[PDB]
Design a protein around this ligand. Structure first.
Ligand code: NI
Ligand code: NI
Ligand code: NI
Ligand code: NI
Lengths: 445, 445
């Protein structure tokens, strides 16, 4: 049954720098906000840090060989600002730039297209000391960083992502206190959210300028399918607020030059530090929109989250180890919504995947049928989306291998490749072996 | 009935620091004389250096796991003076000490006994600038280094070797110009030879004092079986001079407090800078004598080596890729000579092995029957020595894996484990798989 994807479809896997690289003091790297945050009691559920991680800084070539086994034609990673500009600004760290040159050279040598994320949450601590995301001066700082690295890599890297998951950077970082730098303030989150958008917009012309005609760039948004727990007006309203908060807070500014009004009013409109011309910057044209999709979230009115006055409900269904509902149809729905409402020239699924408890068998294999079924359903939903004329150009599985899952530490494994953290051994999981077939087939089954 | 070795016999593999570690600039390491010497045109046959080597500095855990596969109960390695005291003297480099602590801890955790060589040719360049081996001040410099590292590791390392192959350090380094520092002078070689012996003697009481009742220490001598090309007086005399030059120059001082007199006269006795009390120092009692044996060397009167007035002959037989004659009987003869003439309380074969051209087969294996046959014959010779009552306590194969073979570069492979230098992949060779059975059987199948 030829459920084949388009002939140039990009099949990849995704990682982020602090999640896999380790080697946190190597070669002039300065501490990121995450290096500092992991020190805080209760911040990381298993008490771990990203100090070693997958040790990908040293093991990249081996990982690239794994990718060859996987059959991917694309690889999404992030570049660590602390390696490039350890003082946050000013002097370029040659050694740091050199790592990414070696990585990109190795990828292209193996026929793997590099998709580079500029910012995936690891701002140098020294830069955050000067300009936290709630401080407008952060925009120029991120742009300087973008300029340095893009000038060095634009000859080899064609696809760039500006910032990964604005909602996470702003809300979790500054609103819920769950991610670095670990603050919890509604105003700080809204300021951070606005400045992330501004940084994305100011960065785009820089990327295009340091590139060539082939250069493509966009932002990466986390989106999930949102449902109301019931038909009650309070629940419909709760769902609508959460949807505006999670899914529309960035998309509407990016495409329509406005924040969702009802949520804006509810917050207090003056808390967003919009200045004249900001929306013109924010709406700067992009080549694509990248989407990170994981789950359906079902909402009712309540007090669990005091800021939005909502509670979360779990419909009967299948759940991952992250307590996230498995809802493959949600991916189709999100792609369709973006395509009908904003009409981006191209879409990419830059992240999709699942965490389940994995064990290594006596045979030395990792049998993960739940994760495989998860991936299968979502790939199917993406295939349906393409058949419906949605311009989905690629799909990147989160993640290549198990890694530091932020506040959950190393306890939640998202990889299609298992990592034994005692020895750094990599074992391709059953889902990974299956994926090796999908990529070569292009794709299902 | 099986040819079984004694129940506590130590089966091991051997390496040296510059040959395997790489990471030449890491963690405060300063350049050794070999880092400088590799820069010299014509010094290394394939134009290589030890800058990366086997990358064992990073890959030690993996290598140790290979050792477990091999079934060894002992591991001989060397410690890099440039890592421990990068300025040659004075400030201890704790990161350097730390690598060796982690290496030893990991070995003991796997039940592998560490046998540590203090000096295996890598003097820090900065120290050599102050005290080359021909300068008597080198003795106190080596003793300082010995003291620092033996204090840090004596609780875990019981077996220590002071200096590896005095003949090489002095003759190849200062007499033939073939090894670092690359000088070619008879006087400089003899001064160096004498100071190495003195460094060995001064070091012993330091190692004993920093240790406990279990501490065992000795020197490591290269010895080969020597034959005269014919019965002519000129050939006998040539063979005698070579024997005295290669085999007796160090052994006679160590055990009898004298240099071989005829060769001494031949050179000019004033060139050896012997001072009163030196022989009392050189003869300080040792726990064992370690032996590195490879070949039979056949000599005739000739002008090829002008210093000794000798030529070398190749008898009909089997030759390795180093152009060294395979003569397993020689190993027994050497051990028997040392046992009868000097009666050391214990003997170890700290090095024995062979270099043959290896290829990786399409099946991904390395089939090396010539290396296997070499090892078998020599192990048999060692078995015979033990049956004759020679107190051989252990046997270390040179080497665990292919490595930087000094002046021959990476082109000569001595390992029972193949290294693909493009990726650092280790493939246990056929000889290695065979050895995996010998260690477990504790004798020859
Ligand atoms: Ni169909
Ligand atoms: Ni027999
Ligand atoms: Ni390193
Ligand atoms: Ni003198």
């Amino acid at each position: 049954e030829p459920h084949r994807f388009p002939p140039d479809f990009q099949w990849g896997v995704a990682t982020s720098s602090y999640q896999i690289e380790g080697a946190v003091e190597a070669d002039g790297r300065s501490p990121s906000i995450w290096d500092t945050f992991c020190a805080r009691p209760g911040a990381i559920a298993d008490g771990s840090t990203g100090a070693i991680a997958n040790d990908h800084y040293h093991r990249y070539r081996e990982d690239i060989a794994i990718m060859k086994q996987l059959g991917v034609n694309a690889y999404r990673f992030s570049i660590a600002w602390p390696r490039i500009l350890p003082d946050g600004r000013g002097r370029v760290n040659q050694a740091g730039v050199d790592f990414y040159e070696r990585l990109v050279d190795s990828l292209l040598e193996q026929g793997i297209e590099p998709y580079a994320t500029l910012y995936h949450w690891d701002m140098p601590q020294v830069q955050h000391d000067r300009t936290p995301w709630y401080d407008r001066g952060v925009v120029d700082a991120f742009v300087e960083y973008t300029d340095v690295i893009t000038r060095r890599l634009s000859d080899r890297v064609k696809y760039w992502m500006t910032l990964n998951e604005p909602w996470v950077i702003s809300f979790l970082g500054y609103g819920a206190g769950e991610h670095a730098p670990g603050l919890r303030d509604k105003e700080l989150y809204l300021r951070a959210a606005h400045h992330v958008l501004l940084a994305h917009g100011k960065a785009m012309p820089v990327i295009r300028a340091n590139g060539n005609a082939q250069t493509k760039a966009g932002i990466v948004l986390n989106l999930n399918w949102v449902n109301a727990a019931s038909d009650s007006p309070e629940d419909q309203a709760a769902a609508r607020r959460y949807d505006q908060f999670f899914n529309r807070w960035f998309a509407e500014p990016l495409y329509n030059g406005r924040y969702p009004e009802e949520l804006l009013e509810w917050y207090g409109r003056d808390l967003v530090p919009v200045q004249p011309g900001d929306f013109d910057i924010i709406t700067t044209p992009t080549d694509f929109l990248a989407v990170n999709y994981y789950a359906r979230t079902t909402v009712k009115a309540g007090s669990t989250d005091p800021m939005l006055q909502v509670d979360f409900v779990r419909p009967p269904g299948e759940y991952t180890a992250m307590d996230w509902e498995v809802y493959p149809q949600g991916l189709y729905n999100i792609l369709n919504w973006l395509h009908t409402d904003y009409a981006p020239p191209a879409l990419y699924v830059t992240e999709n995947g699942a965490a389940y408890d994995d064990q290594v068998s006596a045979a030395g294999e990792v049998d993960d049928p739940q994760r495989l079924a998860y991936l299968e359903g979502h790939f199917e939903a993406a295939y349906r989306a393409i058949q419906a004329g949605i311009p989905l150009k690629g799909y990147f599985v989160w993640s290549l291998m198990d890694n530091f899952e932020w506040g959950r530490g190393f306890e939640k494994r998202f990889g299609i490749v298992f990592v034994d953290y005692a020895t750094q051994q990599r074992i391709i999981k059953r889902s990974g072996k299956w994926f090796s077939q999908v990529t070569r087939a292009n794709g299902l089954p």
